[PDB]
Scaffold this active site. Sequence first.
Site, short mmCIF file in Angstrom:
data_model
loop_
_atom_site.label_atom_id
_atom_site.label_comp_id
_atom_site.label_asym_id
_atom_site.label_seq_id
_atom_site.Cartn_x
_atom_site.Cartn_y
_atom_site.Cartn_z
N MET A 13 0.81 -1.20 0.00
CA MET A 13 0.00 0.00 0.00
C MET A 13 0.86 1.28 0.00
O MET A 13 0.65 2.17 -0.78
CB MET A 13 -0.92 -0.01 1.25
CG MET A 13 -1.92 -1.20 1.31
SD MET A 13 -2.71 -1.58 -0.28
CE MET A 13 -3.45 -0.01 -0.70
N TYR A 66 16.38 -9.36 -5.80
CA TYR A 66 17.14 -8.41 -4.98
C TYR A 66 18.33 -7.78 -5.76
O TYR A 66 18.93 -6.83 -5.28
CB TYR A 66 17.67 -9.08 -3.73
CG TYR A 66 16.68 -9.22 -2.60
CD1 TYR A 66 16.11 -10.46 -2.29
CD2 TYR A 66 16.34 -8.12 -1.81
CE1 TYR A 66 15.20 -10.58 -1.22
CE2 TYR A 66 15.46 -8.23 -0.75
CZ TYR A 66 14.90 -9.47 -0.46
OH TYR A 66 14.00 -9.56 0.59
N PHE A 81 5.87 -8.64 7.65
CA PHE A 81 4.77 -9.57 7.93
C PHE A 81 3.60 -8.90 8.63
O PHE A 81 3.76 -7.91 9.34
CB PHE A 81 5.26 -10.68 8.87
CG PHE A 81 5.90 -11.84 8.18
CD1 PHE A 81 7.27 -11.88 7.99
CD2 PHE A 81 5.13 -12.92 7.75
CE1 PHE A 81 7.87 -12.96 7.35
CE2 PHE A 81 5.72 -14.00 7.11
CZ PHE A 81 7.10 -14.03 6.91
N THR A 125 9.17 -0.42 8.20
CA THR A 125 8.70 -1.66 8.82
C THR A 125 8.56 -1.55 10.35
O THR A 125 9.49 -1.16 11.03
CB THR A 125 9.66 -2.83 8.46
OG1 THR A 125 9.79 -2.93 7.03
CG2 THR A 125 9.12 -4.19 9.00
N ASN A 126 7.38 -1.87 10.88
CA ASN A 126 7.15 -1.78 12.33
C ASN A 126 7.63 -3.00 13.14
O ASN A 126 7.71 -4.09 12.60
CB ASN A 126 5.67 -1.45 12.62
CG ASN A 126 5.39 0.04 12.58
OD1 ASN A 126 6.19 0.85 13.06
ND2 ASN A 126 4.26 0.41 12.01
N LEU A 153 5.52 11.68 10.31
CA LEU A 153 4.15 11.18 10.17
C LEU A 153 3.34 11.51 11.44
O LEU A 153 2.22 12.01 11.36
CB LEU A 153 4.17 9.66 9.94
CG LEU A 153 2.79 8.94 9.98
CD1 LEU A 153 1.84 9.45 8.91
CD2 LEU A 153 3.00 7.43 9.82
N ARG A 157 -0.16 14.44 11.95
CA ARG A 157 -1.47 14.28 12.63
C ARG A 157 -1.71 15.40 13.63
O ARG A 157 -2.77 16.04 13.58
CB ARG A 157 -1.56 12.94 13.37
CG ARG A 157 -1.90 11.73 12.50
CD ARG A 157 -0.73 11.11 11.83
NE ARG A 157 -1.09 9.97 10.96
CZ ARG A 157 -0.81 8.70 11.25
NH1 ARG A 157 -0.17 8.42 12.37
NH2 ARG A 157 -1.13 7.71 10.39
N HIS A 181 8.23 5.88 17.69
CA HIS A 181 6.97 5.81 16.98
C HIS A 181 6.09 4.87 17.81
O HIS A 181 6.61 3.93 18.43
CB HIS A 181 7.20 5.24 15.58
CG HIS A 181 5.96 5.16 14.73
ND1 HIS A 181 5.23 6.28 14.38
CD2 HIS A 181 5.34 4.11 14.15
CE1 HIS A 181 4.21 5.92 13.62
NE2 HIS A 181 4.25 4.61 13.47
N1 LIG Z 1 7.12 3.81 10.58
C1 LIG Z 1 5.86 4.27 10.42
O1 LIG Z 1 5.48 5.56 10.83
C2 LIG Z 1 4.78 3.43 9.80
C3 LIG Z 1 5.08 2.11 9.51
N2 LIG Z 1 4.15 1.32 8.89
C4 LIG Z 1 4.60 -0.06 8.60
O2 LIG Z 1 4.97 -0.11 7.23
C5 LIG Z 1 4.93 -1.46 6.78
C6 LIG Z 1 4.26 -1.60 5.41
O3 LIG Z 1 2.97 -1.01 5.35
P1 LIG Z 1 1.96 -1.33 4.10
O4 LIG Z 1 2.60 -0.96 2.84
O5 LIG Z 1 0.67 -0.73 4.54
O6 LIG Z 1 1.91 -2.96 4.22
P2 LIG Z 1 1.67 -4.00 3.01
O7 LIG Z 1 1.34 -5.32 3.61
O8 LIG Z 1 0.64 -3.50 2.05
O9 LIG Z 1 3.11 -4.09 2.30
C7 LIG Z 1 4.14 -4.95 2.75
C8 LIG Z 1 4.78 -5.54 1.51
O10 LIG Z 1 6.01 -6.16 1.81
C9 LIG Z 1 6.07 -7.37 1.08
N3 LIG Z 1 7.13 -8.22 1.63
C10 LIG Z 1 7.09 -9.19 2.61
N4 LIG Z 1 8.36 -9.68 2.75
C11 LIG Z 1 9.19 -9.04 1.89
C12 LIG Z 1 10.56 -9.12 1.62
N5 LIG Z 1 11.37 -9.96 2.28
N6 LIG Z 1 11.11 -8.30 0.68
C13 LIG Z 1 10.32 -7.39 -0.03
N7 LIG Z 1 8.96 -7.30 0.21
C14 LIG Z 1 8.42 -8.12 1.17
C15 LIG Z 1 4.66 -7.92 1.14
O11 LIG Z 1 4.50 -8.81 0.08
C16 LIG Z 1 3.88 -6.62 0.94
O12 LIG Z 1 3.63 -6.30 -0.42
C17 LIG Z 1 4.23 -2.23 7.90
O13 LIG Z 1 5.16 -2.85 8.79
C18 LIG Z 1 3.56 -1.16 8.72
O14 LIG Z 1 3.40 -1.64 10.00
C19 LIG Z 1 2.92 1.81 8.52
C20 LIG Z 1 2.59 3.14 8.80
C21 LIG Z 1 3.53 3.95 9.44
#
Ligand SMILES: NC(=O)C1=CN([C@@H]2O[C@H](COP(=O)(O)OP(=O)(O)OC[C@H]3O[C@@H](n4cnc5c(N)ncnc54)[C@H](O)[C@@H]3O)[C@@H](O)[C@H]2O)C=CC1
Lengths: 316, 318, 315, 315
Positions: A13, A66, A81, A125-126, A153, A157, A181
């Site tokens: 996303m 990669y 994950f 990544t969280n 971020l 807010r 965070h």
């Molecule tokens: N630091 C921050 O302020 C924020 C962190 N996040 C974190 O960001 C991360 C991603 O968010 P979204 O894009 O919404 O999640 P998402 O699930 O849509 O995207 C994660 C992507 O990583 C892929 N993936 C899994 N293992 C992988 C690997 N080894 N190599 C490459 N890709 C791999 C998955 O297939 C997926 O497409 C989450 O951990 C979320 O918790 C979200 C909002 C804010």
Amino acid sequence: TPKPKIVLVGSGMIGGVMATLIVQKNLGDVVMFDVVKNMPQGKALDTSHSNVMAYSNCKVTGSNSYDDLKGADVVIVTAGFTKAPGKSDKEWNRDDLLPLNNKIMIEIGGHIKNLCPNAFIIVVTNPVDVMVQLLFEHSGVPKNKIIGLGGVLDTSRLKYYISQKLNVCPRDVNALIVGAHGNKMVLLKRYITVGGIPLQEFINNKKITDEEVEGIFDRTVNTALEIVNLLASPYVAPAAAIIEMAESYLKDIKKVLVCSTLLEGQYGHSNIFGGTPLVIGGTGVEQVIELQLNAEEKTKFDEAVAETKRMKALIH
Amino acid sequence: TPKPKIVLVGSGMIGGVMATLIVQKNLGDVVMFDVVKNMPQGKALDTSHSNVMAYSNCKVTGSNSYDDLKGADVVIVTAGFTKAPGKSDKEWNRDDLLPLNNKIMIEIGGHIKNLCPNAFIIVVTNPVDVMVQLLFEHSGVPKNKIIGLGGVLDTSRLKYYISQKLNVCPRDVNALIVGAHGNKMVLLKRYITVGGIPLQEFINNKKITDEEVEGIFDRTVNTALEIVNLLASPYVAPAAAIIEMAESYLKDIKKVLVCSTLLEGQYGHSNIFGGTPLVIGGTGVEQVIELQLNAEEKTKFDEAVAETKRMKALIHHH
Amino acid sequence: TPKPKIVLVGSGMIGGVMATLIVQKNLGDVVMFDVVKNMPQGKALDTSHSNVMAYSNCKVTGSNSYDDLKGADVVIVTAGFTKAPGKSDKEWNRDDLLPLNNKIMIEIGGHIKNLCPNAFIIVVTNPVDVMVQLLFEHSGVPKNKIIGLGGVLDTSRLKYYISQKLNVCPRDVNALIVGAHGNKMVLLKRYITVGGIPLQEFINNKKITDEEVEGIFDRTVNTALEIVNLLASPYVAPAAAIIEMAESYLKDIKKVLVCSTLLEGQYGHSNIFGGTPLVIGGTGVEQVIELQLNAEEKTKFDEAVAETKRMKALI
Amino acid sequence: TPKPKIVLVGSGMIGGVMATLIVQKNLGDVVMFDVVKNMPQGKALDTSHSNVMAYSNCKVTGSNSYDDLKGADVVIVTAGFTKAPGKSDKEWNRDDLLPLNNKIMIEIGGHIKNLCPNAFIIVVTNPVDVMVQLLFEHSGVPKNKIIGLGGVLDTSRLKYYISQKLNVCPRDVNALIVGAHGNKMVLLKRYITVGGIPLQEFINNKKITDEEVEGIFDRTVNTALEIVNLLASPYVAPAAAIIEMAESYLKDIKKVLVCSTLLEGQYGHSNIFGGTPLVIGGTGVEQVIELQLNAEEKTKFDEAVAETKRMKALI
Ligand SMILES: NC(=O)C1=CN([C@@H]2O[C@H](COP(=O)(O)OP(=O)(O)OC[C@H]3O[C@@H](n4cnc5c(N)ncnc54)[C@H](O)[C@@H]3O)[C@@H](O)[C@H]2O)C=CC1
Ligand SMILES: NC(=O)C1=CN([C@@H]2O[C@H](COP(=O)(O)OP(=O)(O)OC[C@H]3O[C@@H](n4cnc5c(N)ncnc54)[C@H](O)[C@@H]3O)[C@@H](O)[C@H]2O)C=CC1
Ligand SMILES: NC(=O)C1=CN([C@@H]2O[C@H](COP(=O)(O)OP(=O)(O)OC[C@H]3O[C@@H](n4cnc5c(N)ncnc54)[C@H](O)[C@@H]3O)[C@@H](O)[C@H]2O)C=CC1
Ligand SMILES: NC(=O)C1=CN([C@@H]2O[C@H](COP(=O)(O)OP(=O)(O)OC[C@H]3O[C@@H](n4cnc5c(N)ncnc54)[C@H](O)[C@@H]3O)[C@@H](O)[C@H]2O)C=CC1
């Protein structure tokens, strides 16, 4: 000249919005990488056509290899994950997460070390303050070349909610949220300004009340939960924040941005990453600014960092 | 002063990217409307925070009520069905979806009439050349205040693929694609230029071949399918195209853009919408430009409109 | 990272607008160089404060020293003169100034060779098609790293005037003007399009006549005169044209832009600079496009290049 | 909504840069008005061509008729004398311009009242805090629809100089300069922040000394004179500051910007215009923010308004 290369490690996303925004701003060639087959290729194809509307010229390509890390100027990591099995039905754990996401960082870091050791790395990544340090450790990159998303971020807010109550442009509110965070983020009431004017003056003028400010702080903390409840983990604002950080590096803007960086004695902490204002320039982190916190403020900052330390210790 | 109101009727994949781009460009307040509960509200909240990063000030709100169409300056319609139990997990089509999306355009049209009859309307819902005419008919808006998305998106693909072969900026390629959005779109080889230079000059200079052009042509027609098979129905480039159209209206830019519009004798066709270049300014569609096609090009245009009529004639099929 | 260095050799009217636009677009650090003391320092200080309003971070400094060319990525040369002293504006033209300007280009060339031999060079100084070859010869920079301003500006006028008769966005008109910058410029009616559509289709539909097109061709050729007869110097549009060129390089955009470039057999001419479509990318001129002109068009190009040779052989 | 009309009353140095920036930002149709014949028509012709490079569609026309005020959404007044006719630079006396620029405000005010009484007006003509009030009175426009340039320009200098000492983005420094535009401007040390952080933290950390901050204050007050001593009066940064103000209105951004505005009791002062933070949105001045100045800051404000009142009394 020659066009920067931006590799998105993770094309979910947040990844999709980032590729879109990079094209709008003509910032660099983009590689959308994912472990999911075909998906990053389709997203890249769709996004690549938007060059015409944007008057840009950024190659956007999708990858399940990669190898495409080779030559990267900027690497943005959102890979991770989520979800759970059997579990029934609301007790999805935290927490162990944390070894699964660690194995992802090990894999990514090894390829960064081999293929693009001089890239600037942003970790999303969280839990971010833990994962950024894990990637730092696995990749071998310098401390000024890796940071974590958090403060830009979280403060967006706070800025936004205060601006709507006061009827001013969102970006005219300044605010600092530090430490980590997440739920332990430290909201510094004393450092809130509006058009350069201390928040307290607006309170004295009865434009906003102490109670309303506290409700806005609670809403800032609950925002991710609020949006997850309605939709899913937020992605538009997180992408915008990341691109603001990446652009400050690529264009040597030297914006002051709150990000997770390696602490080396600041606020009384070492061997750990924490949220703090910092300066992002063409060489990476150019300055790490330590705020002159009072006692109450330092104790909240200590609680934030203790939680990062706790989660980090679950990794073996 | 005082800030346009833009309503997105449909807050799915396309809707989300449009809200994002509206904020980036500081174009207007956004209402993200959907029949799906909670989803628009969540996307609107996430998007509203990005105002800080963009240095913008656009209110972004989510809604499940048609009442929020009141006072809209621009209305963008991406609303469409919508699958049920069966019967999965792909059983959808679009031939059977025609009566169902017809019913959506009737409902939306009646609301536009009562709440925002002076809005400029852009229809996206497929098949767009059919659906735009249905909305025109049920909303009551004047012919110059409603267009469908087609050519801007279709030509973006053609422009893009040519530019990568010739190694030039994507927007320095110009091309026209007319008739209808969909598999009967008319790709006009004669009207492709590159930096203002006829495409035939690059062919004569062996920079690209006739076979490579036909291959790019096939790839353009089949692009939606290619992306669906890798991913899903395309949404980033469609959103960018819609926003370029909306911006031309809101900023009175008077861009020449290929869009679906009411034909009143052009190309020998009336009582139907079809794709043709037109000028979008602050009053809506200011000029409809009729290309001077040869016999062979006109036959292709005829085939595109015939297919639109065929599908329109199935809005009541059983 | 690290932030490009742009040196403006010449800090008059055009230089001043170029520095303004560079800051607006956050394109790189700017050195404003001039032979006039204090002036470029004064313009730079003023301009540097506009970083705040633009949310940019570009250093803007003034210089009276050629040493500030060191490590330049882009060098833009507008150094020379606008109008002949003793000469009015009812005659506004060019000549007798050549040898002086060659001595400028010899002197600038020397400095470029020594301090920034890997810089991309844009020459603006009139007569541009002559002046760019001179700087090319004395700077020793490769053929793909130096161009002259001509067509982008000339075509902006033609595009603008056609866009206003037809009531469309100015940039939706495409047009090619080639040969040389100045009175012998080759306006190619056949190549004009509006929204990708041949101009001829609008002529057929009576939205514009053949004679109105001829009147616009004349107005395009004579635009600089028209402005000078009303108050001086086109500088705003020339500066925007140059920045369009410079940006295409700095951002590897690969725009197709008509500029003055070394001809090597194109159109039948060599050992001369001529105006022709080129692609500007991150490595400089990446392609030179030779239009497939007919005999009537090739004769007009011949007369344009012949006038450049008449001035080249005369310094 | 859909093409705003911006009328520039005065097409001199600042007017030329403003027209350039409006086209770059596609903000509206532009009328360049001046009492000097032919000159604004020449500048407008040059500027209109830049629409092509900017991908904009703003009409840019030149005018010597006040009729062009009809339909104006925004009117920017830079018209005025910069020196008294027949005087030397050694005999310069700022008070000498008061009655001369008063007459110009009277003339402009009568036309605004008759032709565009609902326009948003921005006054630039010096002494601006006096001139803005004269135009207010003669034009009859509501108090929320007329402001003077001062604080946006003055704070840009302070922000820029601090950012260069601290090595940060110029716009990440925030600062407020209030009271009046000119030598009695109130530079509020207490209110300076860098990335939202009080300036004092940087002092305490020795990134900047108190003496350095004082020299920056002196430089800020004296910038126009510095630029004039090299070659001014300043025009790029003034133009950018005005466009930032006009854009906040045209796009209803609601930016907080320090501008000169009618005081109705704020700071203990009435019947006078003074610089203070305020919010500009689509309806004009939406909020006037009164800062909670301590006693020493208050007396500096009093001293600035005293000087505005002195000059107003001259009329
Ligand atoms: N630091 C921050 O302020 C924020 C962190 N996040 C974190 O960001 C991360 C991603 O968010 P979204 O894009 O919404 O999640 P998402 O699930 O849509 O995207 C994660 C992507 O990583 C892929 N993936 C899994 N293992 C992988 C690997 N080894 N190599 C490459 N890709 C791999 C998955 O297939 C997926 O497409 C989450 O951990 C979320 O918790 C979200 C909002 C804010
Ligand atoms: N014209 C063109 O060039 C193209 C057209 N499209 C079409 O656009 C449409 C939308 O595409 P996506 O956004 O990807 O689909 P989507 O399924 O993600 O979004 C459609 C949304 O409409 C909503 N909806 C259904 N009835 C509604 C109603 N009465 N009011 C408001 N919302 C309603 C659904 O709940 C859904 O959220 C589809 O018909 C698609 O085929 C897609 C690409 C190009
Ligand atoms: N190629 C084109 O389409 C166009 C070319 N021009 C030309 O560009 C040139 C500049 O035009 P403006 O800026 O309007 O002229 P300007 O007279 O206002 O500025 C020229 C500046 O160059 C300076 N200069 C002279 N010798 C120098 C040297 N040795 N090194 C550094 N600086 C030096 C002068 O002091 C002066 O400030 C003129 O030759 C003009 O005719 C103007 C418009 C278009
Ligand atoms: N408020 C502020 O922070 C600042 C104010 N200024 C002031 O702005 C003003 C303009 O500055 P510049 O553009 O540099 O001066 P300028 O002399 O280049 O332009 C002034 C123009 O006004 C014209 N003019 C005179 N009377 C007129 C009238 N009756 N109607 C229409 N036009 C008329 C003149 O022909 C001239 O073109 C000056 O008064 C200057 O002191 C300059 C910088 C900052």
